[PDB]
Design a protein around this ligand. Structure first.
Ligand code: ADP
Ligand code: MG
Lengths: 182, 318, 228, 228
DNA sequence: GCAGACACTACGAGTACATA
DNA sequence: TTTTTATGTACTCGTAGTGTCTGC
C-alpha cells in the first residue's frame, strides 16, 4: 500500500517517474491552454489606428474583409480590395485598410441546426443544390408528408455527415435526433 | 408519359425518360433528336439561365434515347479527387454491353469547381473514344472557355409564339396525366391552363406548385396567393430592400451569389416599376457598374453587398 | 442468420467493390461497383433469412468483430438489425435498399470467347510484383501459342509500349489474335484459383474470374483489341 | 547469370549505402554513398556479363525475391534487365548510368596508419549494445597500450566525455596517439571478420575494413584527433 | 518454430499556403 | 463589447498497426 507518512510527489513526478506514458500524456495536457489562444485583434488595430504589425499573425483577406463587410461605412475600401485587392500583399492589405477605414472603436459582432440537417440531407439524396434542397423541404412541409421522406433517409446520417455540420456537441444530439423517425 | 413510381416528389417522379416526352420548343426538339439519331454523343454543354426549363431532364433524356451507360453527378459533389478516382475508373473502362458512356455534371458552373474543371481539359480528350460528358450550366461564363472548346454549347432558345401555344397544352395534357395518375381531383382545368401560363417557362416551379396541393385533393385554388413569386420577388426582394436594413441586406447577399447573372438581370427588370424616374436613371448607373465589374469581383458575395448598400441608400421608393 | 468466418471474409471483400451491399433472402450475395466496372457474386454456406441493405458494410463488419461467433443477427421488431452476443447486445441501423447501389441484374455470362485458368500463387505473384513494380494496367494476349498476362505502367508508359511483367497461363488452341486490357485498379478478386473466362465481341467485352466459391466479372479497358 | 542468395544478400547490404548502384560486367561490384559517407567494394561468386545501372536497387532485389532462385537474369532486347522464371518474366528497367552516383574507379586505400583486426562476434556485440545504450558514434583510440573502441551517446554526451563501452581489440606497437571517431550510421558493413585499416593525414581520414570477400571504406568524423 | 522487436506505413491532427 | 468560410496542396508529427528479422 501507500507508505502513509511519506511525501507524495506531484502527479507530474508520479507519471514521469513511471514509464506509464498515458498518464504523462495526461500531465502535459494540464497546460493545454488552447482555449486561451489569441485570434485577430488586428481588426481592432485596423479601426483604432493601433500598431498592429501583423507579420506573424493569421491574416485572412477572406475574413478581415468579411468582418468589415458587416459595417457599411467600411465597405468602400472593402469593395476596392474585393476588386483590385486580389493578388495584393497581406502586409499591403492591412496597410491599405489602415488609411482606408474611417473611424475606429471596434464594435459588435457579425439557419438553425435541426433544419440544416434536413436541407443538407435532401440535397445529397436527390443530388441537388442548396437552393433546390431548401425549396424541396419548404414544399414538403406543406404537402405529401415530409415525415415520410425523413424516414427514407435515416440510414445515411453518418457521423462523418453529421460532424461536418456543427461539430461542437450537437452532432451527437443530432445523430440520435433523426434516429426516432420510425 | 414516364413515371418513376418509386419516387416521392412529383418533380423527380414525372421526369421524362425520352427526348420526345420533353416539353421543349421547336429547333431544340429538332436539335436533340438530331443528336440522339447519330447514336453517338459528343461533349455537350446545354445551358439555360432560366430555371425549370429542362436542363437536367434533357441531359438525362439524351442519355436514355442514346441508350447510354450514364453516370449522373452534381457538379458541387464533382470535386477533382472525385474526377481522379471514380470518374476516371468509369470513363477508362468499357461497359460490358458496349453502349455510349456519358458523364453528366449537373450545375457545373458552380464557382468552387474551377480547378476540377481545369482537370477535365485533357481528361475529356484522353477518354473521348469511350465516354463523353454532358454539362448542365446555369451561368455559361462559369464554364472555362477550354471546356466550351471541347463541348457543344446548346442554349435553350426563346420559344416562339407557336412554341408557347403548343408547349403549354403539351404541359396541360402532361398535367392531366399526372393528376389522374396521382389521384388529384381536377374539378375542371380552367385555372390549370392559367397556372401553366402563370409560370410559363418554369415547368419545374409549375409542378412544384402542384405539390403543396397533394395534401389537398383539389387542383383548383388561388395558387398565386401562397408563395407565388418564391424566386425573385418573395425572398426579401421587397420588404428587406427599401427599409435599408443594412444588417439584413448583408445577410441576404450570400443566398444568391450562386447565380449572379440571373439575379442582377431580374433585378434590373422588376425594379423599373417600383421606384421614381429620378432613381430610374440612378439605379442603372450603380447596377450597370456592379454588373460591369463582376470579374474583377474577387468575392461575388461582397460585390452584391456593395450593390445593395449603394442601391438602398439612393432609391426614392414611391 | 449466422455469419461465419468464410462469409464475413467474403463480405470484407465485397465491401471493397461497394461501400455497402444489398442481399435478399437466400444464399446468393452479389454487389456491383458504383460506376459499373466490377461485378461480384457468391453462393455461400451461411443462409440469411430476411432481406437487408447495409450502407456502411465496412463499419458493419467492424462492429461485428467484437461479438462471439455465436453472433445472432436478427431483425428488430421495428426493422433494424440487432446483434445478440453471449452477453452484450448491439443495435445497428439498417438502410434503404435504394441507398446501396445494387447489382439487381445477375444476367449470366455469355459464351466464353477464350478460356484459361490462373493459379492462386500466380495471381499472388502478379499482385506482389505489381506492388513493387507499380503496374496499373494488365493486358491478356497470346504469345508463341501460349497466352500471357502483361503488366505495364500506363502513367509511365502511354500506349503500353514497354512490358514490365509477363505471366504465362497455358496455350491457346484456336487461331484468334486479341489483347484484352484490364485495369489493375478495378480488379478486386480475393486470392485463390480462378478459371479465367474472357468474352468479347465487336466493341463490347468483359472478363470473368471463376473462383472455387465466388465469381468476379470485371470490365475490359476501351483500348483492348480483338478479332473475334 | 543467376544470382546466388549470398550475392544478393551482399547486394541488399550495398543498397543501404546507396539507394542505387552501377555494376559493370565481371565479378567485381562496388558502390559509394551519395554523401561520400561510405564506400563498399566486393568480388562475388556470380558473374555479371553486361553493364547495367539500377536506379532503385532496393526495389530490384525486393522484386527479385518474388521469382524462383533459378531465375535466369539477362540483358533483354528490351534493353533492360530480364528476369526469366519458370513461367513468369520480369522486365526491370535499366537506368541511365548518369543518375546513379557510383565510384568511377575503386578507391585505392592508402598505407594504413594503424592496423587492428575486429572479430565478427565482437562487431555483432557492438551493434547489440549500441541499440540498447543508444550509442550513435564510436571512437577507436589507445587505452593502456591497446587499441580499443569506445561508444558514446552524442545526443546526451555532446562533448563526447562519458564513455559507454570499451571493446578492447588488439595491441598497439607504435608510438602515435589517435582518436578516430566513426558514426554508427556509417557502419553499413555486413557482419563478418574484418581487418581494420586506419589512415589519417592532417585534417583528412578514413577507415577501411578488409573482409573475406567484401571491403568497406567508412569515413571518419570531423572531431577525429590524431598525431599522424 | 515461433516470439520480439525493430522497421514501415497509414492516418488523424495540425499547420501553413494560394486561390475564388 | 465580437470569434470562421471553400477547395486544393504540401509537410511534419504522433501514434498505432503491420512486417521482417532473431535468444541464454
Ligand atoms: N421541357 C420539359 N418537358 C417536360 N418536363 C419538364 C421540362 N422541363 C422541366 N420539366 C419538369 O421539371 C422537373 C425538373 O426539370 P429540370 O431538368 O430540373 O430543369 P432545370 O434543371 O432547368 O431546373 C422535371 O421533373 C420535369 O418533370
Ligand atoms: Mg436541375
Amino acid at each position: 500500500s501507500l507508505f502513509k507518512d511519506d511525501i507524495q510527489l506531484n502527479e507530474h513526478q508520479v507519471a514521469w517517474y513511471s514509464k506509464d506514458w498515458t498518464a504523462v500524456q495526461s500531465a502535459a495536457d494540464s497546460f493545454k491552454e488552447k482555449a486561451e489562444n489569441e485570434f485577430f485583434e488586428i481588426i481592432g488595430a485596423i479601426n483604432n489606428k493601433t500598431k498592429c504589425s501583423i507579420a506573424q499573425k493569421d491574416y485572412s483577406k477572406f475574413m478581415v474583409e468579411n468582418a468589415l463587410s458587416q459595417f457599411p461605412e467600411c465597405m468602400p475600401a472593402v469593395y476596392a480590395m474585393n476588386l483590385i485587392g486580389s493578388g495584393l500583399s497581406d502586409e499591403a492589405h492591412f496597410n491599405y485598410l489602415m488609411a482606408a477605414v474611417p473611424r475606429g472603436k471596434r464594435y459588435g459582432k457579425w439557419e438553425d441546426s435541426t433544419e440544416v440537417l434536413i436541407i443538407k440531407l435532401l440535397a445529397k439524396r436527390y443530388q441537388v443544390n442548396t437552393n433546390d434542397a431548401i425549396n424541396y423541404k419548404s414544399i414538403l412541409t406543406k404537402n405529401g408528408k415530409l415525415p415520410l421522406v425523413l424516414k427514407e433517409l435515416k440510414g445515411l446520417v453518418t457521423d462523418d455527415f453529421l460532424k461536418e455540420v456543427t461539430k461542437n456537441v450537437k452532432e451527437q444530439k443530432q445523430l440520435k435526433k433523426l434516429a426516432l423517425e420510425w | 408519359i414516364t413515371v418513376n413510381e418509386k419516387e416521392h416528389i412529383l418533380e423527380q417522379k414525372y421526369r421524362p425518360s425520352t427526348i420526345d416526352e420533353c416539353i421543349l420548343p421547336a429547333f431544340d426538339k429538332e436539335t436533340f433528336k438530331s443528336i440522339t439519331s447519330k447514336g453517338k454523343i459528343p461533349h455537350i454543354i446545354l445551358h439555360s439561365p432560366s430555371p425549370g426549363t429542362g436542363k437536367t431532364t434533357v441531359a438525362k433524356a439524351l442519355c436514355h434515347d442514346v441508350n447510354a451507360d450514364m453516370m449522373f453527378v452534381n457538379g458541387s459533389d464533382c470535386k477533382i479527387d472525385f474526377v481522379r478516382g471514380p470518374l476516371t475508373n468509369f470513363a477508362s473502362a468499357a461497359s460490358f454491353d458496349g453502349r455510349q458512356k456519358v458523364i453528366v455534371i449537373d450545375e457545373f458552373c458552380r464557382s468552387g469547381l474551377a480547378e476540377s474543371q481545369r482537370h477535365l481539359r485533357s481528361f475529356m480528350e484522353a477518354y473521348s473514344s469511350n465516354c463523353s460528358i454532358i454539362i448542365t450550366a446555369n451561368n455559361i461564363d462559369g464554364i472555362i472557355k477550354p471546356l466550351q472548346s471541347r463541348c457543344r454549347v446548346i442554349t435553350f432558345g426563346q420559344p416562339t409564339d407557336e412554341d408557347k401555344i403548343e408547349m403549354m397544352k403539351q404541359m396541360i395534357r402532361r398535367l392531366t396525366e399526372i393528376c389522374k395518375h396521382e389521384g388529384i381531383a381536377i374539378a375542371d382545368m380552367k385555372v390549370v391552363a392559367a397556372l401553366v401560363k402563370k409560370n410559363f417557362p418554369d415547368f419545374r416551379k409549375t409542378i412544384g406548385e402542384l405539390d403543396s396541393y397533394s395534401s389537398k385533393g383539389v387542383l383548383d385554388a388561388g395558387i398565386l396567393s401562397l408563395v407565388t413569386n418564391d424566386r425573385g420577388a418573395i425572398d426579401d426582394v421587397l420588404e428587406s430592400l427599401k427599409n435599408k436594413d443594412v444588417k439584413q441586406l448583408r445577410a441576404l447577399a450570400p443566398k444568391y451569389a450562386a447565380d449572379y447573372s440571373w439575379f442582377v438581370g431580374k433585378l434590373a427588370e422588376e425594379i423599373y416599376s417600383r421606384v421614381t424616374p429620378q432613381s430610374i436613371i440612378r439605379m442603372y448607373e450603380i447596377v450597370g457598374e456592379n454588373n460591369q465589374y463582376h470579374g474583377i469581383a474577387a468575392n461575388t458575395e461582397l460585390h452584391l453587398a456593395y450593390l445593395f448598400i449603394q442601391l438602398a441608400c439612393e432609391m426614392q421608393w414611391k | 442468420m449466422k455469419l461465419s468466418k468464410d462469409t464475413t471474409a467474403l463480405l470484407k471483400n465485397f465491401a471493397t467493390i461497394n461501400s455497402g451491399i444489398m442481399l435478399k433472402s437466400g444464399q446468393f450475395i452479389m454487389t456491383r461497383a458504383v460506376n459499373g466496372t466490377t461485378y461480384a457474386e457468391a453462393n455461400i454456406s451461411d443462409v440469411i433469412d430476411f432481406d437487408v441493405a447495409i450502407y456502411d458494410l465496412n463499419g458493419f463488419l467492424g462492429i461485428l468483430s467484437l461479438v462471439n461467433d455465436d453472433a445472432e443477427i436478427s431483425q428488430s421488431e421495428d426493422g433494424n438489425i440487432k446483434i445478440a452476443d453471449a452477453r452484450s447486445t448491439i443495435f445497428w441501423p439498417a438502410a434503404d435498399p435504394s441507398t446501396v447501389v445494387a447489382p439487381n441484374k445477375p444476367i449470366p455470362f455469355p459464351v466464353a470467347s477464350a478460356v484459361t485458368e490462373i493459379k492462386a500463387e500466380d495471381l499472388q505473384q502478379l499482385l506482389r510484383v505489381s506492388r513493387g513494380l507499380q503496374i496499373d494496367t494488365i493486358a491478356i494476349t497470346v504469345k508463341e501459342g501460349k497466352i500471357v498476362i502483361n503488366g505495364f505502367n500506363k502513367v509511365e508508359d502511354s500506349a503500353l509500349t514497354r512490358v514490365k511483367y509477363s505471366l504465362t497461363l497455358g496455350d491457346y488452341d484456336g487461331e484468334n489474335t486479341f489483347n484484352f486490357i484490364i485495369n489493375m485498379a478495378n480488379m478486386k478478386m480475393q486470392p485463390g484459383n480462378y478459371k479465367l473466362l474472357l468474352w468479347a465481341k465487336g466493341k463490347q467485352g468483359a472478363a470473368k474470374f471463376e473462383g472455387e466459391h465466388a465469381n468476379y466479372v470485371v470490365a475490359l479497358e476501351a483500348d483492348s483489341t480483338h478479332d473475334f
